Every structure is written in structure tokens, then in C-alpha cells.
Ligand SMILES: O=C(O)/C(O)=C\c1ccc(O)cc1
């Protein structure tokens with residue numbers, strides 16, 4: 001799985017161990033070994049949400065399977081809670097794009113997962 | 115809707131109110147309330163277009179519906195004009211990826227839009 | 229085609245001409261004129277792969293066609309080798325998302341490719 005977070009929150013506001021917490025939490029959430037989870041956090045972004053530049057986040061989760069109505073809702077609960085708790089970002093100011101990737105469309109280690 | 119712009123144009127070249135202009139213009143364009151529009155601008159990027167590092171942009175627009183042949187062309191007219199006017203980026207050096215997101219695949223406020 | 233690379237590798241570690249090499253190599257690979265190839269490299273990223281912050285990369289290749297099982301594997305061979313050679317990133321720590329874009333969903337020069 002691959003999780004990317006973009007936020008206008010400053011770098012100094014991201015607590016230590018955030019990436020590790022994201023990795024653990026996502027491995028738990030997806031049922032995938034943490035050795036496969038990729039996390040990426042991009043702070044200090046020039047962004048706005050609903051016209052306001054109040055703290056906000058635009059993220060995405062790419063996974064080969066594990067994507068669906070019920071699962072995505074759990075993911076949002078989780079991810080929004082972490083951003084609200086760890087980054088002080090209001091959940092109503094967070095967008096998360098879900099992507100169910102086909103194994104043949106994910107490249108890794110000189111090949112694909114197909 | 116979610117609009118992201120990546121450009122090699124320096125930060126100093128992005129005029130004040132650009133994010134607000136993008137928000138307004140996109141709300142008009144999509145017929146969605148501006149309180150739902152998320153805009154993100156990433157300047158000073160290390161990029162090239164057709165081998166040249168002349169001013170250029172790589173963007174994407176994610177929307178739940180409002181995506182199709184005719185609409186996408188309007189969007190491009192608009193977005194390219196703004197980048198050409200506001201950022202001095204030649205429209206033939208701008209790429210915009212359109213994404214018709216399924217409501218169940220967009221997370222927000224501890225859940226999805228499903 | 230559009231290729232984006234995100235890595236934790238410092239800027240100073242990206243060799244000169246890397247973007248041009250990526251452009252050339254991708255044009256060869258896809259059979260598309262290099263005047264259409266867009267490349268974007270984002271170094272010094274705050275990321276982790278499998279819990280480790282050892283050098284790694286999260287990339288994506290968007291193309292209108294030229295995407296499939298066999299082609300994607302070639303792309304991965306190529307891209308991973310360049311990252312391993314040029315950036316010293318282990319291929320088993322690189323993810324590449326492949327996207328077969330529909331022409332009507334790609335905006336360029338005030339319109340779409342439809
Ligand atoms: O989804 C998975 O199970 C996986 O192991 C890896 C993955 C990594 C990045 C990506 O964009 C899609 C899938």
C-alpha cells in the first residue's frame with residue numbers, strides 16, 4: 001500500500017515517529033505486512049480548502065485490493081483521526097483519494113506484482 | 115473537487131490570491147459549492163516538458179462526476195488560460211489529468227462520500 | 229507520457245542531465261516522440277518504505293495507451309535500473325504506479341487529446 005499526505009501544516013508540527021505510526025496503523029488496517037507499506041508526508045504546502053487556508057490535507061491511498069465502500073470508510077476514520085490527533089487537522093478539512101490498483105499496474109523490484 | 119498544479123515557475127511568480135481565484139473559477143466551472151473545492155499549488159519544481167525546462171505545468175483534477183469529453187475541454191480552456199495569464203505558462207506546455215472519482219473512493223470527515 | 233519520481237534522496241545526489249536522460253529513455257521505451265514526454269523529480273522527501281527511511285522512491289507513469297502487463301514490466305526494469313544506477317536506490321525499494329489514461333481525460337493546450 002502507498003499513502004501520501006499533503007498539508008499546509010509546517011514541518012515543525014509533524015511529530016517524530018509519525019511516518020512509523022502511519023506505517024504500523026496502515027499495516028494493521030490493510031492486513032498487509034508493514035514491509036510493503038510506503039508512507040510519504042509533504043508539509044509546508046501552498047494549499048487551500050473551501051477557500052480557506054486553515055490547516056487541511058489532501059491525501060491518497062493506493063492498494064492492490066483492500067479498497068471498497070466499507071473498507072474505505074474505516075480507512076477515513078483512522079487516517080482522519082491520526083491527522084486530527086497528530087497534526088491538529090480538522091477531519092472535515094481532509095480529502096483522501098482511494099485507488100484500487102491492478103497488480104500488473106504496480107511496478108516494484110524491476111518488474112510488476114502481476 | 116481537487117485541483118493540483120506542479121510547476122517549475124518560482125514561488126515569487128505566483129500572484130497573491132491565485133489559490134482563491136482557482137477555487138472561485140473551479141466552483142463556477144464545476145457547479146460545485148466553493149466550500150468543497152481543494153486547491154494545491156507546488157512551485158519551484160524540478161521538471162521538464164518535451165526535453166525543455168521552459169515554464170511548464172503538470173496538474174490533475176479529481177471530481178466525483180463532472181468529468182467527460184466536453185467538460186474536460188472546457189476545464190482545459192479555463193485552467194490553461196489561468197496558468198498562461200497568472201503564471202505565464204504556455205498552454206502547449208501544460209498537462210492536466212482528469213479523474214472521475216467514485217463517491218465511495220473519496221474519504222472525507224471520517225468517512226467517504228458514498 | 230508523464231513520469232514523476234518522489235524520493236528521500238537529497239537534491240545534491242541527482243546527477244545533471246537526469247531529467248534529459250529520463251526523457252530520452254522514456255521516449256525510446258514508449259515509442260512516443262520526446263517532445264511529448266514530461267518528467268518531474270521531487271527529491272529530499274519525507275518518506276519511508278517498509279518502515280525504513282533508507283533511500284526509496286514512489287513514482288508514477290501516465291500514458292495514453294502503452295500500458296499493459298508486458299510493457300509495464302519493461303518499464304519497471306528500465307526505471308528501476310536508472311534509479312539504482314543514477315540515484316543509488318535499491319530496486320526493491322521503488323514503487324511505480326502505471327496509469328492508462330483515456331485521451332479525453334488528458335488536457336493539453338486548451339483542450340484534451342480526444
Ligand atoms: O497494495 C499492495 O498490497 C502493495 O503491496 C503495494 C502498492 C504500493 C504502491 C501502490 O501505488 C500500490 C500498491
Ligand SMILES: O=C(O)/C(O)=C\c1ccc(O)cc1
Nearest residue numbers: 095097115116150176177178
Ligand atoms: O468531486 C466532488 O464533488 C467533491 O465534493 C470532492 C472531492 C474530493 C477529493 C477528490 O480527490 C475528488 C473530489
Ligand SMILES: O=C(O)/C(O)=C\c1ccc(O)cc1
Nearest residue numbers: 209229230264290291292329
Ligand atoms: O500518452 C500520450 O501519448 C501523451 O502524449 C501524453 C500524456 C500526458 C499526460 C498524461 O497523464 C498521459 C499522457
